[PDB]
Swiss-Prot record, chains A, G:
Minor capsid protein. This is Minor capsid protein A1. It is found in: Virion. It comes from the Viruses. This protein is translated as a fusion protein by episodic readthrough of the termination codon at the end of the capsid protein. Changing residue 33 to S: In strain: Qbeta_3_FR.
Length: 127, 81, 101, 131, 127, 127, 127, 131, 81
């Protein structure tokens, strides 16, 4: 599919905050797509990047990489104080079925909302 | 048998039932306080975005009202009736 | 883990500082909620924390914090919406209400 | 918190799959927990590893790493026991500044959780079609 | 003493099943006894070995269990994998009777404790 | 899992006595747990060690019991003799759950059989 | 014992401030337990760490180490300004009795509230 | 302040023990005070040492160090005088920033004092059982 | 003979007695001001969380009231009646 206004609802603490996004072109150099929020500041925008990696003669392994980054706002023109970014990398073999990849993706999505992970992330309590 | 549905993120929350108990719809772990299991042991359905009480022992101490109250994310910032 | 509060306010005046109090039995506290009763309807929460004043209410109420005792202060009664008020905590696993006006 | 059995509901593309995870202790060499499927030969489970990391002389920011493995076993024609053929890794690593509150971390976690159900990501994963 | 058919029962993960043991005579080479089950082909046969030694004493008990699968090429079954086990008691010539029996009793009652039944059922080390 | 105070009871030659165990934390050097009894001086202290390994698996459980006498010259008690014990399970990565549990069950129930209680109580080898 | 909500009352200047704590898991690498306060900030939390050290082939000496650290808050997202941390290390020999260790601990606890130490700490007047 | 006799009440596990400390001056080599038991041979007392430290070219933060020693003497069977056999050290070191007020220091001191009576610490000390 | 008990941290404080004296319950070091030792020399018990005056010389200048006042940590922030 192409890039459209990816909208997310019922998100965050208390499960009420919503987030809208807009396409921001595709960089053809490294084959990376980019998203952003509607704020009019180049360095205070939520950014979502997705990409693939066709197998080369040096890798022979499909790679799907999704990155997220959120900056912070502090007024002292507001500046950026803290970065908080996360990376997701999938690896698939040439003979990976559709069922296998979909299963991996959706079980990661479901397990990411499990109480173990929310206590391992929000309060950083080791398992 | 009481039931209610909402419009927020039904999963990743709690469903408070007090005139008693609360449930997390995903990986349902119930909590009982006040009395014993009593009359108000409860279940939850994540697919239908609702929670149910079967309300056994239909004798008279279940008379007036039960309020469906919403709790969000375990620890703080909850009880959004 | 019961709490106590002063009942029967019955303040018919406009300028009031009755300041309903909720006496915490245990010494933990640190998490108190205030509820109001509509005469013929449901209920809506006032302050989720001690005194941060959840939105949807005029900037005229404050849940005071003090040693082993908490109170809710009104600036001046608007002669309406004053029938019943509730106070409750959630710091301990068995939660409970607070009976009284 | 403590390790217990973790149940996952409504899995797979069709939405009707079940996965059950049992705790497998924490490795004291590096401090990484683990999980595993209920009944399987110890070479054919579905490993799920979680871990945190406090700052040191380097990497002053916090770090959370999650690795999962999904080996697929095909029984060789006329063979004794099944052998592992393919792999499907998936690495999820976070990064948090010491002063970052819980709000930002929770927002990142839930945004990542919700993205994996957006049409863009499911298409880019199932058929591997870029933007 | 005298090796005799010992029938220990009510064992197994379910606990319902039981097995019988048949003496197979000590060999003069190293004074090591042998016990076994006469149910099946000698290659696919559960074996128990107990060897009380002489001088500090050493009492060593080894139990092993073979499991087999029907290879397609050869009609006869073959051993696929072998599940060893080892118990090696030790003592001093001045050690009394009750102090000796304490080790055996604690080892017998600890394998029935959840701590080792979990550490030996799913191979998860204690944390 | 999580080491917790395990209280195995009704053991001993008479069988009336019992002991309690206190966790003492795993060391990072070799991933070996430790359990103990807090009753007495640390030198004169019963010790239990369980060490689940990683790859064919190895599960090794060691229990040792020290006994002391009051030396006339020195006021402090000293260790006189040390009663070792060793259990060394082994497995293959393809071994299932029930086949694993069979070894543990048979070893637990065989130490209660007369054959080994006699061979480990009075150090008389089987004939 | 295990980790629970360690609560402390009647603490501090004027003897009225109270402090609650929550468990935050046990790091298995260095065998260190950790505690924390209920604040939702990873770098503005009171931290209590306790641990032991089983004797190695290089130490031969029991070590119990308890650490405390308290940060400060200053608003200019609030930042950290001053650190104020303290360390307690006990050393015990293998034949240390229970009476001896308990006596050392409790007399340290009592002497830590003596007027000499309060004037040596709060105002840092040398003795 | 000034050194005097320091009396300690309600000591030991049973809560019925008494310890009396007499001043022993301050060592001018490094500026460390000392204390001692009332009546004992100078090789068998219960040394208690306290000291402070002002900043220098290094260690810009304040520092307080407390060391205590509890030797235990067993009379050798058929011997002239008792000999020291075992030791029990206990080192307590603080650290304070120059700008730190008295409130924080007092809070740290009283929290450390109260912790040593919590069930966790008494168990971890008497029987040496970790968490 | 007057006595009173409290609910705060009884140790590490002072117990003021003025219509005169004060005591630190641990390592009791008394303080006398105003008159001489007089009638109000005092003691303290840390175990029972209370302080006592025996009030010798029972003649008439001890008539109306004595107030039990609480002082905290020597120097500042005290007199919490």
């Amino acid at each position: 599919a192409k890039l459209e206004t990816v909208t997310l609802g019922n998100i965050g603490k208390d499960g009420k905050q919503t987030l809208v996004l807009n396409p921001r072109g595709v960089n053809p150099t490294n084959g990376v797509a980019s998203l952003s929020q509607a704020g009019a500041v180049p360095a205070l925008e939520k950014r979502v990047t997705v990409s693939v990696s066709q197998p080369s003669r040096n890798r022979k392994n499909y790679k799907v990489q999704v990155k997220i980054q959120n900056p912070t706002a502090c007024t002292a023109d507001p500046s950026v104080t803290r970065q908080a970014y996360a990376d997701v990398t999938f690896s698939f073999t040439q003979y990976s079925t559709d069922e296998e990849r979909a299963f991996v993706r959706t079980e990661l999505a479901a397990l990411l909302a499990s109480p173990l992970l929310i206590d391992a992330i929000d309060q950083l309590n080791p398992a | 048998i009481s039931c209610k549905s909402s419009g927020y993120a039904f999963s990743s929350s709690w469903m408070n039932w007090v005139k008693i108990g609360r449930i997390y719809p995903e990986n349902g772990e119930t909590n009982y306080n006040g009395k014993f299991k009593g009359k108000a042991t409860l279940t939850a359905d994540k697919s239908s975005r609702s929670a149910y009480m079967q309300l056994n022992s239909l004798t008279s101490e279940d008379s007036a009202v039960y309020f469906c109250a919403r709790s969000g994310y375990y620890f703080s910032s909850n009880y959004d009736f | 883990i019961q709490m106590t509060q002063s009942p029967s306010s019955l303040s018919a005046s406009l300028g009031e500082r009755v300041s309903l109090t909720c006496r915490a039995s245990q010494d933990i506290g640190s998490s108190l909620n205030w509820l109001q009763q509509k005469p013929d309807g449901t209920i809506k929460r006032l302050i989720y924390a001690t005194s941060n004043l959840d939105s949807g209410v005029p900037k005229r109420f404050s849940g005071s914090r003090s040693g082993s005792d908490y109170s809710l202060t009104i600036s001046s009664l608007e002669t309406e919406d004053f029938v019943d008020y509730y106070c409750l905590q959630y710091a301990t696993s068995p939660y409970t209400f607070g009976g009284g006006t």
